[PDB]
A paper describes a structure:
Here we report on the first crystal structure of the human ALDH1A3 complexed with REA and NAD+, which has been determined at 2.9 Å resolution. The final human ALDH1A3 model contains eight identical chains per asymmetric unit, arranged as two independent tetramers and a total of 63 solvent molecules. Each monomer binds one molecule of NAD+ and one molecule of the product REA. The crystal structure of ALDH1A3 reveals a tetrameric assembly with intimately associated monomers. The structure analysis confirms that ALDH1A3 shares high structural homology with all classes of ALDHs and folds into 13 α-helices, 19 β-strands and the connecting loops, arranged into three functional domains. An important feature revealed by our structural studies is the precise definition of the catalytic pocket that consists of a tunnel connecting the protein surface to the catalytic cysteine, and that likely also represents the pathway for substrate access and product release, as previously predicted for sheep liver and human ALDH1A1. In summary, we observed two different and linked conformations for the REA-NAD+ couple in two different monomers: the first showing the REA carboxylate pointing toward the C314 and the second showing the product conformation with the REA carboxylate moiety oriented toward the protein surface. REA binds to monomer D in a closed conformation, with its carboxyl group close to the active cysteine and extends its β-ionone and isoprenic chain moieties along the whole access-substrate tunnel. In monomer C, REA binds in an open conformation with its isoprenic and carboxylic moieties pointing to the opening of the catalytic tunnel toward the protein surface. A remarkable difference that we observe in the active site structure in monomers C and D regards the strictly conserved E280 that shows two different conformations.
Numbering used by the authors:
A (entry chain B): 22 to 343, 347 to 357, 367 to 508
B (entry chain A): 19 to 507
C (entry chain C): 20 to 508
D (entry chain D): 20 to 507
Write the structure that this text describes.
Amino acid sequence: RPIRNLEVKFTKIFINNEWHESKSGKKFATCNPSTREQICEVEEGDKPDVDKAVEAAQVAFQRGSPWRRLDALSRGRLLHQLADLVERDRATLAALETMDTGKPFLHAFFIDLEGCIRTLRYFAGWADKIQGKTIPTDDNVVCFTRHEPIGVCGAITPWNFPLLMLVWKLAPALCCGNTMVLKPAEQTPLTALYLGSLIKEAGFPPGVVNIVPGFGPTVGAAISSHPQINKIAFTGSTEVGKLVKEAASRSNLKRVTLELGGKNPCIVCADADLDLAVECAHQGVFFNQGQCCTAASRVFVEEQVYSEFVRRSVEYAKKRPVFDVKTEQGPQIELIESGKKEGAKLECGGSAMEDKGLFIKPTVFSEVTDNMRIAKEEIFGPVQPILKFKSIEEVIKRANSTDYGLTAAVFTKNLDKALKLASALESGTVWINCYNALYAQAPFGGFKMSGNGRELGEYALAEYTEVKTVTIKLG
Amino acid sequence: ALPRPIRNLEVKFTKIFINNEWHESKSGKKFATCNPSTREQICEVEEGDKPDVDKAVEAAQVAFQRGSPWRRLDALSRGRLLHQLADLVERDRATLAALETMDTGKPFLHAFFIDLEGCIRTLRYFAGWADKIQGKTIPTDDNVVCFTRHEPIGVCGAITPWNFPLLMLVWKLAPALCCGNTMVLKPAEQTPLTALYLGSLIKEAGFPPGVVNIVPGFGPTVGAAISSHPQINKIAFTGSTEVGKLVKEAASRSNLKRVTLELGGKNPCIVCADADLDLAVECAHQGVFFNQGQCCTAASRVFVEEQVYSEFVRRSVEYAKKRPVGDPFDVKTEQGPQIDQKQFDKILELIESGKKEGAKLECGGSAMEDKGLFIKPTVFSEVTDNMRIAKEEIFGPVQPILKFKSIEEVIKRANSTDYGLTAAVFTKNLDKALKLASALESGTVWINCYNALYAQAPFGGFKMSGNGRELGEYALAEYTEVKTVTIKL
Amino acid sequence: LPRPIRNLEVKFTKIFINNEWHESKSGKKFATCNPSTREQICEVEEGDKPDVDKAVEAAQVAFQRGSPWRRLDALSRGRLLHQLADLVERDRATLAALETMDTGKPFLHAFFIDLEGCIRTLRYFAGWADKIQGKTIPTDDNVVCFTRHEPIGVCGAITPWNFPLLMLVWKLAPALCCGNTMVLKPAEQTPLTALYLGSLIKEAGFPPGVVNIVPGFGPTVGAAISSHPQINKIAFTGSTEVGKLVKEAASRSNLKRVTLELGGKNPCIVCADADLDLAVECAHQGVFFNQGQCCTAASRVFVEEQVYSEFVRRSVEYAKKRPVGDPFDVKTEQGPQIDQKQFDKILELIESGKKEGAKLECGGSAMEDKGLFIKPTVFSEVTDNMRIAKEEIFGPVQPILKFKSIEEVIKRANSTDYGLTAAVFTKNLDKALKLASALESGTVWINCYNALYAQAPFGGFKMSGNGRELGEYALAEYTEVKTVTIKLG
Amino acid sequence: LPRPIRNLEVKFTKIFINNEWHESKSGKKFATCNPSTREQICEVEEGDKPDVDKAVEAAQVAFQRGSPWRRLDALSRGRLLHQLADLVERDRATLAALETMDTGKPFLHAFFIDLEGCIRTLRYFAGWADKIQGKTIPTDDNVVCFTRHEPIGVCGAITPWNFPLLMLVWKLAPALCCGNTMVLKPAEQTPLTALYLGSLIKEAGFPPGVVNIVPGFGPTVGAAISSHPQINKIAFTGSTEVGKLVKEAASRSNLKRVTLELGGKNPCIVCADADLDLAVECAHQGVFFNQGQCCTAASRVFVEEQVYSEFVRRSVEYAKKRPVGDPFDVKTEQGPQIDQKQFDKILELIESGKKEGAKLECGGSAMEDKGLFIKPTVFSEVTDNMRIAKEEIFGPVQPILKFKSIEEVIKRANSTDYGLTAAVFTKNLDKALKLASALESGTVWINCYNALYAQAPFGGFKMSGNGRELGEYALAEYTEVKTVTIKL
Ligand SMILES: NC(=O)c1ccc[n+]([C@@H]2O[C@H](COP(=O)([O-])OP(=O)(O)OC[C@H]3O[C@@H](n4cnc5c(N)ncnc54)[C@H](O)[C@@H]3O)[C@@H](O)[C@H]2O)c1
Ligand SMILES: NC(=O)c1ccc[n+]([C@@H]2O[C@H](COP(=O)([O-])OP(=O)(O)OC[C@H]3O[C@@H](n4cnc5c(N)ncnc54)[C@H](O)[C@@H]3O)[C@@H](O)[C@H]2O)c1
């Protein structure tokens, strides 16, 4: 399976199903986080490159265009085709993802790529099921709504789940007849660029998808400010998302959906299946080195089970292993101190591993409290702050005390507690006796400052459609 | 019979509504709203600023709070309160119509039968949605139970314009309340009256205290404090495009609160030779001129096919001149004063522009009499795409009539602008009508009609005419947050 | 709170057609009697095929195109429903009384349950009236495809005596909401309330012919409906055997559309981790409510071995102690059984339990004979084989069974040809959701019983009927989906 | 383009149960014949009640809780469906040939229509599988209320001879994506495609017992299905008379649920302001498509007075210039009438037009002396009362009526007990939309005919049937709504 010495075939700007060099001629250079060594130079796009791509997108989206004349099932066939090719070339994409992220290949293969496929097929099924409405009004009137495509849509995605995150936009966008302008992170532009090949092979017309790699303030900012981009979807940081919205509003009031991060709680009750709670919550905090937006950053446990839970979690940290079949965590592309200075107790880790890359030991705090920064600030790293609570009412308030709400998980055997907390928590997703359970068909998103809009599920389709009303009076 | 005008009406409600009680300014200060038609001040209203907005939002926050009387209601009870509140709006209907006529110059009958009828039907429409706001059960794995909950957002803000002060406020109030969240309103400074009245009724109907708060004042002040507030979660704005940008930006800078916008448009009205020319002429007239031409749905570009063009203009001239202008309160008046001195200028300045860019003036072209702010109905012909009266939002009684030859031509000319609120089409051809309707980049396309809106039919803009939608089942999307619950057994 | 009307005179006793009161064509009458005070009440007009013929033509002319009903706006149709729930509220106590008279229900149960129900249901569907939406469907680029959700037409409603007005409202509300016209037909034992409601339908302002009532007998009038060439849909609630007949009748005649609510043998399942008090009080109300003369009745109560005994003892403490008596007294929870016949039907079966060996824990005999009153009975050591946990008991009898495992209780509970309702008591999340999924009921309650909403659909599985009443799902039953496909040149 | 397989060799002839081929309990067989080469094709096993019991039993078990088919995840059910649409595509030419041999349908027509439909239908619903959603309903603060859309159980399908594979797929597609198990029963006159589809259902990986097929006769196997106490829903497409019977039996037995799709006396209304040329060709393909043997068939063509005479002249030109012949020849647009009973039935009604005074503009007879081929036939000056304006012909006959007023045509169109389809030709926005409202039909076409999509529901008003097929609307017919209500 592993393809360790894989050649990179695609490094240029995809626009109109043709490969392109920068207008400047500049390149920048991506690196294998694991080796620290350069992989290849890929083309560095800037403003003029974006204009080129957006004019492509507009032509493809023009009325009379081939892409627009396609009937509805056929937009669906194309995606089905595109999924098939991702699946065909699954191991490559998996291998390229590992090459730019450091993600374990098996993980990329079974998680990132599994996701891209399912999502692509999920949303192939919506293409002929995008329905407006016939609205009753007056006897002498025929009023209905059309769910039109918006137009040119841009995607701007982060480095942790590059392809997946990109695919979450692409799948629905195209399903609804939009045309796109993608920008993967500077750190990880390989699998995106590969996919563009696959988008050509699958048979999408020219300029329905265009890709310009580069930097945020150059390429990204060119998009968000662009007067002919109609809609945008960003996933990345709270700090940058605001800029995107700020930029959309100054420009053409383009539509923005944002998926940013969060201070996601896990809430463990005395009556929980304690083992599972320790297990899941550990998969919550530490998965991908804590470099996942769904990351569990705040673990709440009830007094009766507090000391027990911690022991078990300290037990979990040390015991799992460090492209191999057995590798569970890859390299990183203080808060730990301020926890010590503010009085929290550390039961394991607290420093780096051995002199081989930016790896932190799994670190677990106990005696944590709300006022602490390890409970207030996005760690983006393998730190497990366990906090104590007594009242289900207390924990509901404490849990909701951040400006975020992307995720929450609640462990309990009690039906009434399960649904209570579920209604009370302010989070786009509430897991009950699981963590990281996501589906192409279940919507995902954030409350409050974790984002706007939703991705996946039917709800996704609203973000890539413009509702037009046609109201007809009869004589 | 026609309700009888209340010319002597005494403003009862002038202060800041917060927690179901009236309060004066944190500063003490007050501003003054006048009657466009009398030129005479009506009264002084409390002037609000940040410290007041903050007092209000904490009411809204406390009432949205978990456990609060407002949150524990049945769905249907929330819906019943909405019904009650329309009942009061209908009982005090003539009174509320009169306020809106004193404040804006609107003909009394128009406010009575249009503005208030809208508020009523819309409150009732959304009263209806209260216990029909439904999430989903979603199939996944055998071992998993997955479903969504359409939750209320939290505190919602409303900032509205002067042209439809109550209506634009209601369009936001109705679904916002229907969906179980709390509010903080700011009406336009030029028109704070009818919204303040709506305060008293929202109390009488039995909405718990703190569910609705109304802090009148200015845009850069109260408008800004609302837009930027850390504990406001959604905002609905209706107003000038320029001020939307300002609001969306601030939302974006502050807490990423969510934002619906309704901005202006440059709405095309397309008339084909095979149209019923009378209907077309009659509809485009009311489309241009309704509400003193001060409405976003206004027809700022009438496009007419050459075969029927000359007569179109001829019939459209009749309607312009025959149209009664004068006292809002007189039963025969269809046209009242422009809201204030500024718009009266803006409109005049631009009318001169139409003559200074060479358009053939067919009626009016001037103020009507020095008394006040009354502009003659004006019609321009031999109009072209590049004149200012053909690019800019006139927001006054002015009917530009352009010309075209082919449908494919008129679609491009229609779609040339950055806005897309409304379009209208007149033709007897089934194919033309549906072609145009598909092609026009407007949120509402009308066919053989104009200004046909329904509470059940959504309203909003393409491109730079705005973001979300208002009215319809669609409107509940802007007041709900989707929460996904996923359970593994 | 509200004061009984002990001797209320019946005003409405005649055939309602075109908002006019008529007497039978034959001239016959029939007479309804009071279970609590066995005195005949009044004589009510007995109709037959020719009376039906007359209503169905009213209903047709009323559904005819151009008619005032048909031309109403959506919202206006909902206003009419809304007003009808207002008048039902005003005369609520009257209605409660007539129902309480005709059926024997405690007056207060008729007031806070039956009529509460009619009102909420009427108000809920008034709210659907302008929200009954079809679809625009993406097909080809050259094509406009959309569905219209149209009214079926003349719909007939045939109802039982256990909840005379409620069952009639479940059908009238959504039917009129989607724009159909109706012919109604209450049970012969209970024609009073319906006939009343006709006066209200007239007052509230629905045009003539929209709703007609024709009381009478089943094999006479009911059969004339089910067989009727110009009736387009039917809803029937009642017994299975009559059900199948109406379906057959329909198939032969014009393939009119049919939805059925029939009985069920509805299990309660109780688990050891249940809230034990809560589980007895729910199981108790559930078996015994409306003298056990309810389709939702719990006929088979399952209880886990560990927690069995103490269940039985708390059940009998509820059973002995619950006050039986005169409907009109504030403190009576149980009234007479509907009549002499249904009062004896059950007592036969009370021996079934004693015959095949089942420990009776309280009651067991008819109490006093000059009234239709059975003492609340509870059986224990009940088993699957026994007729008491197998045939529709139609009354106040609590068969309590025994089980060990969750898998055991899932096959047993499912082993009937019925599945209208189920209930589950446990504090466990996985067990509850498992069972909710596993059981084959149209409604599964969890730690509650008889929790119904005008919002939540109700209807059976298998032989318990077909179709759903209440909720959004109802409208499906009162509409005919039409597809309009248009190709553009 | 695709090549006829003229003497194809039939592989599948037996009863399909638990993904195994079976012989009748009787051992008896019945013979299938080719309408164009009046020769027997092969013998098929002939089922009866004991076979049906065997099949229902299989399908109960496959539906059983904990069964593999019940445990497949949402998306996987839609994967298997896609797979099958894959196999149907691969073997498209074999199948399209069987259907022509079985039915007399022009190979190319069966290929690019019947088989096209099946695949798009399969694919469409493969798509709904993970999108079948119930609702979360707000009630009290106290309460969590939601619905589930559960499969009903064992579904039966009974289908006619005119579109054996198509009509079967309209039922199987939504039934299988909603999680059901099925017992199929194709027409005795056209069993072959349904029997081939079993190998694909097997090859594609559906578990044993999910789909079962019992070829045979109406009163035996249909009646054993329709009456079965352990079959939960029945989908019937066929004659009104058998519809009624199926429905009664459903009622009498276990109150099983019933969808029906019956015939119609569909109108085609042509106004003077139509694109006459467009109207003539659409009406023409409407009446004669599938040798007239389709339930969407345009059996009353109303034409406004001005364009009436002209309309008739063009209609005969198409009528005579339509190639009738060997199904397998590329040029042939019309084939043989399904068999002898229909062939005879059609010709009597033609004589009925003659006996009642309709002006015959072409045909009026059989063609090649002793085949099952009828010359395309056009009647003119037709009136509402004649037998050709009243009874489903189901043959290449085009009865043409005249009208004056719209309201008159509305009334005349709606005068039958049927409402399956209608169609309207006009350029006029108002006139089209007014008729669309007024015509009591499940499907109204405007400036087209026979335009169906796997996303647009189809079904009857009035006695043309109850319930719907195709579109989201179909999933309701293959599911049972369950309300779950929790009190905290
Ligand atoms: N084409 C367009 O987009 C468009 C649309 C409407 C009006 N206009 C122009 O605007 C003028 C009148 O203004 P208007 O009331 O219609 O719209 P406006 O945006 O000036 O006012 C609408 C509301 O916004 C509030 N507001 C003002 N400044 C604000 C700020 N900085 N932050 C938050 N809220 C603020 C005001 O108080 C008022 O409540 C007219 O001359 C008209 O021509 C243009
Ligand atoms: N709308 C109508 O009235 C209509 C439509 C088409 C054909 N027909 C008549 O029927 C004949 C052709 O029949 P068809 O195949 O179109 O439909 P059909 O109703 O005769 O039978 C079609 C399907 O139903 C089955 N079936 C037959 N009898 C049954 C029974 N007793 N119980 C259960 N299932 C049964 C058949 O075997 C087949 O599977 C024609 O000669 C014509 O006269 C009537």
